[PDB]
Amino acid sequence: GCWTKSIPPRPCFVK
Incomplete structure (x- = not known):
């Protein structure tokens, strides 16, 4: 997923 x-x-x- 998306991560900094x-x-x-x-x-x-995040939904």
Whole structure:
């Protein structure tokens, strides 16, 4: 799925 590229990754385009 969509994830930001940080430590830690964050979800994106969550419905």
